[model samples]
Target: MAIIKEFMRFKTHMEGSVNGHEFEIEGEGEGRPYEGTQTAKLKVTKGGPLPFAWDILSPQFSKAYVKHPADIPDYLKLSFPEGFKWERVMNFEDGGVVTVTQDSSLQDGEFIYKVKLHGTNFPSDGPVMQKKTMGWEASSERMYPEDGALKGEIKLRLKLKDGGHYDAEVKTTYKAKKPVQLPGAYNANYKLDITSHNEDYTIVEQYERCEGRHS
Candidate 1:
């Protein structure tokens, strides 16, 4: 088992391209840098054992909030459809370049985590960097490389674009309306089976915009 009763720190960076345009950003963090088509990696600078608690491996940061002086942006002004208010970094997308720093502290004997997002997620447009505290968790299983055939009840355990796990628990199904594809962008809803869904669930991707490098 593992636990973090102390503070651990890490640095992060982001770089990617879109439609042949190249750009990148950097900052500090405890997780991996976000790149197009690849989810930012959340790691422990100080890690050990198993069953230990950790930070944001989930692309969907559990929760976050913005404080004073940081006025919310108009999604309309930002080119977002409209009516959707500005929120923190919670949504995961293809070509998402995200950088994060994680602070895990012991509370009531259980480890809890907080995350800060530096300037990241370049596969996006307009202002995305906002101040907020995010929640994350870590476990040492073949979680990353979801392998094997899935069985039993399934739900939205994985993302259709990036291979980030749903921050929540087991479900039997995920439902979404159809997608509206645009010229330069598109939005859609999808679901995946995770319990019995293994390697295959982690392998296929629904969106790939501008990620040319793989190693």
Candidate 2:
């Protein structure tokens, strides 16, 4: 096969304040499980252009974990495996996109992408957290088509208030980058790694898989 599309799956291990808390979510269309690790399991499904959902297999922090809107500053801080500077694209009741910029010898790149909402009342009402902000980093390469079709990889690290953090590596393939013709959505495959830290930034939990997904 020429590899029209490929799906990769893995797991996510969570620590810090979320150690005992359950975490799960649902995306847009018909969803399915792609990978699992630690306490997290990820499922991704595909259908039309727009609608997408991420269903969680376990419980979440709170009822709000299912429908609460993502904290913009918190989301920005976790966009990259390594922290970076962020800028907002737009903010609305529904959701918006944010851009992340970084300059490091490790990756040495820049990128910009859009993070939109599938439904409403995420994280708070559902086990899902809305894509509050999304854009390209300074080190990212533009490989997608001009028509808004994209295929690439993303490594996201979510830092927690307790000093620990979670990391997820995602691979995405899109049919529409700008929501031109149809609803404008894409498919994603992901791998997650979870770790914890102490006051001294010591590895408390280590590498664990929380969830994985492919669609």
Candidate 3:
């Protein structure tokens, strides 16, 4: 029997630019840096543990906004097609570089996946960083590996065909501790941490609970 509670920690930093604008951002759990001229930082970092188990089937169930910013380049300006907009590190859909596997038991049955936002799927032209890549590092020592959660530092970068580049490095530590009830209603068991209209990191927290009554 296990009432095992999971704990996670994160550290993030983002620098460089997409079009002509420059970025200098940073973050971790609740406080990091703020958005401003030539710089923006992730503020109000928060996310609740997924209401279910952490395993291979639903690998990225847990959601956390570690490095979200207040103002980001609009999709139209960056030439993104209609129905697409800039997404944060924690909001990426499955596929692309995000996947799940149980090919080894040597290192706790290592699992590898990347939770990120990049131009890999929708590569385009123009003045923007067509291949801008930013997100978390995938692959870890498989604790309960065959299928488990991921923990690592943030990775960010910007590159121009003209030879301009920027890489913002980050460091994060991990620990497992008792679970503290996240901010929510008395019976809340689920949440939605939204980035708010795709304009900034003004997260809107919505909470809900299981359908049936608890005895």
Candidate 4:
């Protein structure tokens, strides 16, 4: 059987100081994968931040949309088992993607997944600080589960060309009982810090989904 469509509803809260300026970013949205494409609409709020701009839009309270291919063909063809490793380009949203290598291994009773970025034009477009990154490294602790609810901590780092960087730590829990299926629900909290050649900021974000549906 194949999933014809998948849906996820999530909420997020992000706050940080940029270039010594303060701001808050909050969002709630629904995203779906249908007919090999992904689309979503987000209700966002940007309050009191310096540089005074939202990457998606400068909306104080409004909506933002995104569309992209559901997955990279090569990536979808690959299988990730213990000791498996491969590199491929993957999309994020709004015409953004990066080349990265991924690998998996058994760590403390579960499979730990890790990714590192390479190649060019990274970020392509997104948050200002992230768009300047020269490299990205991300990893999770025991994220791929053997059974039961999957829970773990994920860490992400972006290094910029000017000796600046962005760091993010995420704690997440997801429930998925079926084989080869996306999680049915999720809760994730994020904390981030950024230091750029001319900016400094810290962020706290949250993500939660009571349930996701697929057909």
Candidate 5:
């Protein structure tokens, strides 16, 4: 089976200091992905210089919109198990995947990883035509204060064939705010923080098909 046209109905809000600058970003959008392209409703609030601008008829909210590809083609990315397996397929019987085969969990959002990389019925070799072991393992615990928290985030310490190593993480959070009680909801509050690199990104959103909130 394939993942096709999933309907996502939700409001969004984002806040926090990015690069030391204080900002509050908010918006509401919904999508029901279908085929080659897509169609949806989206907007950026005027609260900050983000998703979109609120001021400067031609220059103030201070920016433009930049779109990124959904998935990178044939890109080797991410982690394993008693864990899970994710496949990036440009087509059938020719793709790559990785699985974290170890059973583990973290305390309060700690890093959990233990896996290997392999080709899923993929080409014997890439443009290089030479085989290589890109597999790596983490042999140590690396932390920064309260890991995966506002103050700091702990990361996985990789053990490379050589002394050179790296840290990787994939964290995603979705938060919502505002008019959950009725249609044409007003001033919906929401936040999205994806901390792939160390540091904290939190958005405690509440739209819970909820009644209403008093600001």
Candidate 6:
């Protein structure tokens, strides 16, 4: 139980790498810094239906974003009713049980649950098609002058069941906007700007590039 929970946490907080050289022009324009660190959380639940939510906690100069990997769908799609799948899987697993829990607060809140199956076909056949694992795995540069500039690289590795794996690397460069003051404590609004991203997949040789701007 604990091991599964820990895996979930690791999956949620993982981020791909960033390379800074690509954003030379944009970094100079915004006076944005090149890099920063980030933290994220993901919670999944099953009741009337299966649902999930995610949150990101990052430094003043960094911001998080969610995107559907090219191979996965944007949302989860299942054929059975919420409880039917669990019941059937439990029977196959010889009395294995599913657990659910919830937590709430004024500013930040979350609910999460997990079910264990012993003899499911999922592992052998691979995750269900069109059913994707959703979470925040990317970051962007600050958009405004008040936003902190990032100036470093962030890298991440992801495993795919179909066959192989992929890697994402982001390089950042920042131009300081007057040496702004950082908050004494955590502030959700204070975040770093992302100037560009250099994404690469091992299966493919070419890299995909994305550039950001303040509108």
The candidate that wins on lDDT is 4
Q: Could you estimate the TM-score for every candidate?
A: 0.20, 0.20, 0.21, 0.28, 0.21, 0.19
lDDT of each: 0.23, 0.23, 0.22, 0.31, 0.21, 0.21
| Better candidate by TM-score, 1 or 3 | 3
The Cα RMSD of model 1 versus the native structure comes to: 20.9
Model 4 clash count equals: 3
Lowest lDDT 10-mer window, candidate 6? 20-29
Pairwise TM-score winner, candidates 1 and 6: 1
lDDT of 5: 0.21
lDDT for model 6 comes to: 0.21
Worst 10 residues of 5 by lDDT: 55-64
lDDT of 3 by residue, 107-186 (tens): 12211112231222211342122333222223221111011112333332333335644332322222122222122111
The predicted structure with the larger lDDT, 2 or 3, is 2
Question: What residue runs in model 4 are displaced by over 4 Å at the alpha carbon?
Answer: 1-24, 28-30, 34-47, 50-142, 164-170, 175-215
Pick by TM-score: which candidate is best? 4
User: Which of candidates 3 and 5 reaches a greater lDDT?
Assistant: 3
Give the 10-residue window scoring lowest on summed lDDT in candidate 1. 141-150
lDDT-best of 1 and 5: 1
lDDT score, residue 23, model 2? Answer: 24
Q: Going through the candidates in order, what is the number of backbone clashes in each? A: 16, 59, 0, 3, 12, 41
**Local accuracy of candidate 4 as per-residue lDDT tens digits, 1-215:** 12212453334343434334444444433434222222223222343423322221111110111122232111111222223343344333333333434343333333333434322222424444344544344222223332443444445455555675545443433332223333332222222122122232223222211111121
lDDT of 2: 0.23
